[PDB]
Amino acid sequence: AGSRLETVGSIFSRTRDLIRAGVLKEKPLWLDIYNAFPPLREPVFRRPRLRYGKAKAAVQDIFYHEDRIRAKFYSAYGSGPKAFDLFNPNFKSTCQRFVEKYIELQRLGETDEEKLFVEAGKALLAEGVTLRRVG
Amino acid sequence: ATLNQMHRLGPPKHPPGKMGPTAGRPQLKGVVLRTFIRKPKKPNSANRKCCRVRLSTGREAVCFIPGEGHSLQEHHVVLVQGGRTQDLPGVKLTVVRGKYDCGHVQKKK
Amino acid sequence: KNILKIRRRKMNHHKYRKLVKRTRFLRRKVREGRLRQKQVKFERDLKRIWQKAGLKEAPAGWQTPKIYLKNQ
RNA sequence: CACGGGAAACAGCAGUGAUAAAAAUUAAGCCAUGAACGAAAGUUUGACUAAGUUAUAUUAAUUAGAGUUGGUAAAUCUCGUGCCAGCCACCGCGGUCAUACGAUUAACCCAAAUUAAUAGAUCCACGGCGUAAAGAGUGUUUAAGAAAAAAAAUCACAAUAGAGUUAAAUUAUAACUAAGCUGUAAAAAGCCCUAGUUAAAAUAAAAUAACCCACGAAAGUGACUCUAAUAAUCCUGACACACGAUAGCUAGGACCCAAACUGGGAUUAGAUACCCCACUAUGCCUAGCCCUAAACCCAAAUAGUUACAUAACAAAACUAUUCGCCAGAGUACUACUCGCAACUGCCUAAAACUCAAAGGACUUGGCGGUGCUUCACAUCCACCUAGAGGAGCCUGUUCUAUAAUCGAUAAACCCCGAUAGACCUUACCAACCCUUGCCAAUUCAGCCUAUAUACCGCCAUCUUCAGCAAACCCUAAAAAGGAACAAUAGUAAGCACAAUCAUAGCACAUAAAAACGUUAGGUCAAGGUGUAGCUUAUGGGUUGGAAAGAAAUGGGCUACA
Ligand SMILES: [Mg+2]
Ligand SMILES: [Mg+2]
Ligand SMILES: [Mg+2]
Ligand SMILES: [Mg+2]
Ligand SMILES: [Mg+2]
Ligand SMILES: [Mg+2]
Ligand SMILES: [Mg+2]
Ligand SMILES: [Mg+2]
Ligand SMILES: [Mg+2]
Ligand SMILES: [Mg+2]
Ligand SMILES: [Mg+2]
Ligand SMILES: [Mg+2]
Ligand SMILES: [Mg+2]
Ligand SMILES: [Mg+2]
Ligand SMILES: [Mg+2]
Ligand SMILES: [Mg+2]
Ligand SMILES: [Mg+2]
Ligand SMILES: [Mg+2]
Ligand SMILES: [Mg+2]
Ligand SMILES: [Mg+2]
Ligand SMILES: [Mg+2]
Ligand SMILES: [Mg+2]
Ligand SMILES: [Mg+2]
Ligand SMILES: [Mg+2]
Ligand SMILES: [Mg+2]
Ligand SMILES: [Mg+2]
Ligand SMILES: [Mg+2]
Ligand SMILES: [Mg+2]
Ligand SMILES: [Mg+2]
Ligand SMILES: [Mg+2]
Ligand SMILES: [Mg+2]
Ligand SMILES: [Mg+2]
Ligand SMILES: [Mg+2]
Ligand SMILES: [Mg+2]
Ligand SMILES: [Mg+2]
Ligand SMILES: [Mg+2]
Ligand SMILES: [Mg+2]
Ligand SMILES: [Mg+2]
Ligand SMILES: [Mg+2]
Ligand SMILES: [Mg+2]
Ligand SMILES: [Mg+2]
Ligand SMILES: [Mg+2]
Ligand SMILES: [Mg+2]
Ligand SMILES: [Mg+2]
Ligand SMILES: [Mg+2]
Ligand SMILES: [Mg+2]
Ligand SMILES: [Mg+2]
Ligand SMILES: [Mg+2]
Ligand SMILES: [Mg+2]
Ligand SMILES: [Mg+2]
Ligand SMILES: [Mg+2]
Ligand SMILES: [Mg+2]
Ligand SMILES: [Mg+2]
Ligand SMILES: [Mg+2]
Ligand SMILES: [Mg+2]
Ligand SMILES: [Mg+2]
Ligand SMILES: [Mg+2]
Ligand SMILES: [Mg+2]
Ligand SMILES: [Mg+2]
Ligand SMILES: [Mg+2]
Ligand SMILES: [Mg+2]
Ligand SMILES: [Mg+2]
Ligand SMILES: [Mg+2]
Ligand SMILES: [Mg+2]
Ligand SMILES: [Mg+2]
Ligand SMILES: [Mg+2]
């Protein structure tokens, strides 16, 4: 008839092989299509073991230097006045403005944190944004 | 075990066969002391004809008489052999029918 | 389940302790006897030694202590 | 051993006594080889050569008999037997339909052999140790080994030993006050030199913190303070060394409270127990022994990995180096040994013999004087009404009784087969009779003879219980299980339930219905029948008899006004 072993191979494997053995006398559509543009990974069954011991996953946490800045921003001023619009693809927040200013004053060569930070706050007050801070 | 431990004990050796009722001989010759009857064990019942024999090795032992019917009196010499009778607990020997004073079973007449 | 095994031993042990209580002074006698025997075989072992060495009497000042018959 | 001494030698070939399950000729030649001797021709040789004997084994043909036929494991039919007689290597067979006994018929398989008995050959672990046999109560070193690449020794907390101290209880003991106090599911016994309050040394034991997880090698350690203090530049390692819960022993001291034992009280058929009261050894301190625990986290130490990969259950699977252990179950934490301050001891640890299993985990049932929910509707308790059990009768059982039926006989028998026995009915008893003896025919009629544990027929019962069951599909395997509705693997025809029908309109009630199975439930005496029995009788007829109440009891009737 066919092969109901899900665990043994891919559907591709089992199908091709069952044709090979002359059991399955008609080639199925999806077969030719499959051969033509096969998937990236063979869809063979695999059992999901729980990890043990010292082993952990390989997944990298996502950070950028800007973050190192944003933290100081949020610690100081909390979330900004402008709220957030996660619908608007190009939306820039108050934090992001502060970031860009800080980066620009970094390019003038001031290596002190205080100078960069406060002067970026000033550069922002210039444009008309209010930093109410927090205690 | 580990390789050392296996080195230290040597390989395993097959224990010699422990010896039975006939003392490793195929038959024994013995004289009949008494003829009696024994009940089998529980699950299945009859009353089995046995005798007591004294054997050439001087050891005295219960022994069983095959076939239906027999003539055996004290002082008859018989020849006994090793088959153990499954019903009877304790009875490890069997009279050889057809030798010395135990004759072959007589067909019904 | 496993207790069946334990139970068996349990019984065995009980019955045996009981028996040692009944059979006690019989047992006393037999053990004292074995101790005397032991002491004797020991003495013989020693005597045998100083004789096979050609000496007649045991060497000077040799009392051959009583080790097994040692007071309880 | 052989000077000596027992004593008078076949373990040369044949023979022979004895003995054993065990059985070759008291034979012929030196012709060949070998050996001895000879210068040599040669002689001698039970070595040996050629023969004799024997199914011991092969082979060849002249020779056909043995074993087996329940499964393993090739092959069976009809009688006889009836848990008897007997059979089997192992499982097992035999209780009236035996392929398993015994014999016959057929077959199978070996074959001049075939079975049985006994010894071999072969066969255990380069496997395992949470739950099955097995990680040895703890650590250190010795011997012996591994080092095989990269590093490390180290800081809250209840280690251990000393010495000192005490908050909460409790108690000696007085002072008031009260007659009781104590004690249980309930009592009794005990105590009233008792109880409540107020005062209190000693002794012992260490709420809360702790929902913490520390210290120690383990056993163990959690009131407070101080002193001393927790090996190794860290692999494994004993039978050597040093420790080791509780209990127990010796000696001296303590004693609040607990308590084996014992004595009282209940309980019970008994109660040498559980429950109540008293009280002792003992639990404590000092010193010495003893060396055992379900000393179990039932999971060895040291380094590692999370790759391969589910027997089951459990605490997922594994590598390397080691050491300790384990070869069916009982017998056996036993008997004997050695050692030990142990003397009813610890340690070490068999065999005869017995068995064909013993074990481990699971599965579905059933059950549970187990827990939690929910119920019972004439139904358990609470409750309502009328009765039974006592009387007389009526009628049935059981007994006893007779020459004198049978059947039912917990629920699910007992005014039951019987909506029906004076003769008949009728099957029983006793006398008598009749033997192709109901019929178209029949070496045949006939049988209320045995078996309801061979049955059909009818039923009872769980039951006004809700399940049974074909055909499929699913499950890191399946013995079996298969639902989740905001749905997770189930679809299912069929039979039951349900619905309809009946009780002359609905409705309700009642009736009817109620599967698969359970009780080898009831009935060979409704009838019919399988198997086995009788045949001038276990068959067919006639006449007459079947009594009876010591006693026990069921159900009714009539009453007691
Ligand atoms: Mg039987
Ligand atoms: Mg036999
Ligand atoms: Mg003969
Ligand atoms: Mg026993
Ligand atoms: Mg000699
Ligand atoms: Mg001879
Ligand atoms: Mg000689
Ligand atoms: Mg002879
Ligand atoms: Mg022979
Ligand atoms: Mg002869
Ligand atoms: Mg010659
Ligand atoms: Mg010659
Ligand atoms: Mg001659
Ligand atoms: Mg036979
Ligand atoms: Mg028969
Ligand atoms: Mg057979
Ligand atoms: Mg037969
Ligand atoms: Mg032969
Ligand atoms: Mg074990
Ligand atoms: Mg351990
Ligand atoms: Mg132990
Ligand atoms: Mg005192
Ligand atoms: Mg009283
Ligand atoms: Mg405390
Ligand atoms: Mg250390
Ligand atoms: Mg070490
Ligand atoms: Mg101790
Ligand atoms: Mg003590
Ligand atoms: Mg004392
Ligand atoms: Mg005391
Ligand atoms: Mg007390
Ligand atoms: Mg008492
Ligand atoms: Mg001290
Ligand atoms: Mg412990
Ligand atoms: Mg252990
Ligand atoms: Mg170790
Ligand atoms: Mg094994
Ligand atoms: Mg054994
Ligand atoms: Mg012990
Ligand atoms: Mg012992
Ligand atoms: Mg021994
Ligand atoms: Mg009622
Ligand atoms: Mg009335
Ligand atoms: Mg009444
Ligand atoms: Mg009455
Ligand atoms: Mg009757
Ligand atoms: Mg009858
Ligand atoms: Mg009857
Ligand atoms: Mg019944
Ligand atoms: Mg009549
Ligand atoms: Mg009549
Ligand atoms: Mg009749
Ligand atoms: Mg029946
Ligand atoms: Mg249904
Ligand atoms: Mg499973
Ligand atoms: Mg199913
Ligand atoms: Mg269906
Ligand atoms: Mg109607
Ligand atoms: Mg209705
Ligand atoms: Mg009805
Ligand atoms: Mg209905
Ligand atoms: Mg019956
Ligand atoms: Mg009956
Ligand atoms: Mg009939
Ligand atoms: Mg009556
Ligand atoms: Mg009635």
Side-chain angles (χ1 to χ4, degrees), chain A residues 86-101:
Chain A
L86 308 180
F87 307 88
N88 186 8
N90 303 318
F91 172 94
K92 300 239 166 206
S93 186
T94 299
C95 185
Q96 186 67 7
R97 277 182 168 190
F98 191 105
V99 165
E100 280 143 4
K101 295 294 180 180

Side-chain angles (χ1 to χ4, degrees), chain B residues 2 13 18 24-26 29 44-45 47 84 107-108:
Chain B
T2 96
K13 228 173 176 198
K18 166 194 167 172
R25 304 117 129 307
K29 191 197 197 171
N44 112 79
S45 172
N47 40 44
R84 140 191 168 274
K107 295 311 167 181
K108 17 191 185 184

